[PDB]
Amino acid sequence: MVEGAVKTEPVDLFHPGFLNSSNYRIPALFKTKEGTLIASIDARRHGGADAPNNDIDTAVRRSEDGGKTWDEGQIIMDYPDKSSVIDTTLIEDDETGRIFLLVTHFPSKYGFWNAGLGSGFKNIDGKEYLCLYDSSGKEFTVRENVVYDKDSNKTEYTTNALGDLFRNGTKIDNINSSTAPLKAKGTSYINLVYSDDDGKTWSEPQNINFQVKKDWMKFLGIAPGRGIQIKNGEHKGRIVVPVYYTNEKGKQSSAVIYSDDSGKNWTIGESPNDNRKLENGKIINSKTLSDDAPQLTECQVVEMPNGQLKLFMRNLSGYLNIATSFDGGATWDETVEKDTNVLEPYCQLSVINYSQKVDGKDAVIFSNPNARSRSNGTVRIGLINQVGTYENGEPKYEFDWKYNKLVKPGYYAYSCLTELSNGNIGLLYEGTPSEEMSYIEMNLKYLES
Ligand SMILES: O=C(CO)N[C@H]1[C@H]([C@H](O)[C@H](O)CO)O[C@@](O)(C(=O)O)C[C@@H]1O
Ligand SMILES: [Ca+2]
Ligand SMILES: [Ca+2]
């Protein structure tokens, strides 16, 4: 290493036995406005396997000294009996100081492959209510935590936000378990929690599926890592959270959900697959997509100097795919770019804006496995250059991957970056499949060397 270069020796920020979890996957890492680092992760309690073959809880650690020391952690979401929360994402509303963590939630027995269609909510007279089902398949609704039957008679059952099921006020089970007399629909749900004390305490989960999941979506999940809050332009203040979904045919398409009211209400935008123009001119849609090749899956979003959004997406082309939005994530330009300078082995990636210019250019930082497998973990600095304009007159931005640094030889899978208070880069990465999750700090002198 050159003199002054910083690449800290890896710290196992999560590992077998921490919080009595045997396994860990899916890192998220975020520096709050106050300067605290929040790291979130799936505590996979029965091996590394994805839902439904596990019981997965959400864990958090905090650092108040720039990542040099970390607290003893806490579990912030835990559903019973193999109902899992998987794939976390972190963002903050800088106006209110509220930190958000969102995650995908499945009842017991459900996961990506067998999620049922739709939101799991039903409209009764203008409001969406979570449905519950008994053993005969009869449908009930939960209205302000009171269970009503199909004839709108109040039953003896109530619920709470965690899904506990109470009979005349006594807990008997939980609507997410394999044994409850009333169960939620077996599908994915987006859950949201928040902290107003810099990550020390967290709310109980809000189920926002009724706002963001459409009737024709089977799986709808958080794309893990981080979100953004838009800094420039007409959508300044919008909180943007990457997601992805499958249609009835099981084919995956990326999107973002977003909030213009500090996280109170959410909307899902279109996918880049909606009215996408494929390489030779075929027009597709995420609702009708029937082929594997154009799928767009996990993704992360960054903001260009004028506010334009770029969605970096896991896909099946072997290379990075990038979509562009002129309207704050509501829709995407018809052309998804393939960047053959950036291998993408079908794995989650991390990309963040960087606050200072590099070589006279606005820059982003990027992390993924630079290979055709989950290996050769590489952190890149991409310099933003405008190369002309679209037909609508908007600027066209391209990335120059000028610096590309191998940080993890051997296994490298999911990862998440953050800029640190000192201008350096923190990185939490899967350097093992599902055991030790490693944290390092790197400076730009190292990354450019
Ligand atoms: O299964 C889900 C969503 O419910 N998420 C997993 C996700 C999905 O299974 C995958 O993105 C679906 O194509 O991928 C991982 O299996 C992986 O590729 O390593 C890990 C991630 O937690
Ligand atoms: Ca649990
Ligand atoms: Ca489009």
Author numbering: 1242 to 1690
Lines from the paper:
The genomes of most C. perfringens strains contain three separate genes encoding highly conserved GH33 CAZymes targeting sialic acid glycosidic linkages: the nonsecreted 43 kDa NanH, and the two secreted 77 kDa NanI and 129 kDa NanJ. Here, we present the structural and biochemical characterization of the GH33 catalytic domains of the three sialidases of C. perfringens and probe their substrate specificity. The catalytically active domains, which we refer to as NanHGH33, NanJGH33, and NanIGH33, displayed differential activity on various naturally occurring forms of sialic acid. We report the X-ray crystal structures of these domains in complex with relevant sialic acid variants revealing the molecular basis of how each catalytic domain accommodates different sialic acids.
NanI possess an additional N-terminal family 40 carbohydrate binding module (CBM). However, Neu5Gc (and its alternately acetylated species) is a naturally occurring variant of sialic acid that is present in BSM and was released to some extent by all of the enzymes, though low abundance made it difficult to confidently assign the structures of the acetylated variants. We were able to generate a complex of NanIGH33 with Neu5Gc, which highlighted a “Gc pocket” that can accommodate the additional O11 hydroxyl group of Neu5Gc. This pocket also appears to be present in NanJGH33 and NanHGH33, which is consistent with their ability to release this monosaccharide. Based on the relative abundances of the released Neu5Gc variants, and comparison across the three enzymes, it appears that NanIGH33 is the least able at releasing Neu5Gc, whereas NanJGH33 may be marginally better than NanHGH33. NanIGH33 was most stringent being entirely unable to accommodate 7-O-Ac modification and was comparatively poor at hydrolyzing Neu5Gc variants.
